[PDB]
Amino acid sequence: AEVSSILEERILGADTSVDLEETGRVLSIGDGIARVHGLRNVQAEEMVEFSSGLKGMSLNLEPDNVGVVVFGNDKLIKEGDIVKRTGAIVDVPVGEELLGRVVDALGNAIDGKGPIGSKARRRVGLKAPGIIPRISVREPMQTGIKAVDSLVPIGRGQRELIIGDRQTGKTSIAIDTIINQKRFNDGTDEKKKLYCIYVAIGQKRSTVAQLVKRLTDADAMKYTIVVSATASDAAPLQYLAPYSGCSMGEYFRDNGKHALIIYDDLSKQAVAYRQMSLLLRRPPGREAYPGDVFYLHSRLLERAAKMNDAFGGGSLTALPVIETQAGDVSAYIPTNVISITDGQIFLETELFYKGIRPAINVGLSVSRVGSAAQTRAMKQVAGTMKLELAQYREVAAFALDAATQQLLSRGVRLTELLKQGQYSPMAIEEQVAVIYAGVRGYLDKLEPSKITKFENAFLSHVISQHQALLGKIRTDGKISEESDAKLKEIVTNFLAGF
């Protein structure tokens, strides 16, 4: 009954205003690109609209016609159609109204659930913040993966890169990072809350549905936006989705809040851009990618800044995901994005199958911030762990004397310590406890195949009996002398009793 009534409520308010608008006739439509004739005052990369309510962007301004890319399906545009200029550069809704909503590349709700109540709009193609607004990266972005929080730490405002082959565990790292922020977002202080944005480019709708249901299960859509430009979405949408998500995150950083955006992948935005550019007839380049393929990404990843306290203090981290071919990191787009970003996280299939998951190749993975953007406890412990693994990797290819035998033992113990499961990120203090137990020669007595057991068991013990110690480590943010003595006695007692 009231269903029809709320249906009427929609008619009750319409768009009576018909205006005198500039137009153009579609000389030629084919392959997703229209060649409009007219639109004399249409701007560059403006948003135009077609007679069927379908949008497009005027990308080419040639003397005789305007090359327009259609944001949607192309079968509905005929020749001699009508294109009306909307007089507005391409822009997307922004605000907290988008949190928990799945939206398409243009900010249209995609999961039903009504419309977006956004009260503001932001242009996708905005220039990056200057040199003066920024400030060096200070806080840590807690990822939950032990091997990332310890060996390749990520700060807030950094631009890490997750690069690997197909099916090595990149989206898994992204989802673990998203899920971990629940503990901070549930708390009270607003200086730790991190709103997450996930841009899904070229992924089939089933994958994004699995991902969204996984976030819902972990109750992580309270603060997540999902911008999906899946495979069946015209190339002009997969091209533009990263920029839409980056605007949704620029809104957060511009208002003193913190945001995390995860492009997934950028190697598919590159392909969509190449298709667009080849269908506008622009000359190809190397591997057929346009010449402006580096710019495409550099202008996009340069928006992940760390504003100083005069500009709000907000930040915007970025975790672009690249996909290499058989580990050929030396390809074109991989090298471009490698020389654009800060750190990197190399996932390798030889490590994925050898049992090391996440496959993070700690030997090659880097993080320019390194020291900074790491908690003092983690800084204390992960340093010694890093040295121990660095020494171990040198003498690992084989498998005598007591010193090097114990060095290999410690290396292997730490290696089996760094493993982890899926969608179970650990609090930083728990990581510190586990890594401390491992690196203070305690596990050297145990067999390596059993280490995982210990790990799990140990936490389930400390998480109940010694909540006070973990709270101490979190609050004070360091392993004080008394905290160290406690940790020592807890580990010594637990090891024997197990």
Binding site: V3, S4, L7, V18, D19, L20
Partner: protein, 48 residues
Amino acid sequence: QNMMRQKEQEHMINWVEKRVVQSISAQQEKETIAKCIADLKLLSKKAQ
């Protein structure tokens, strides 16, 4: 219940538009055209 809600909503929409596309086939001509030229007058005087 929500499934039935949305299914009935879509049926309402479809039936209503199917009826309106047939109703509009009548001949309100003079009135609507006069209103159209009135709107043209409004746009013209409101343009310059």
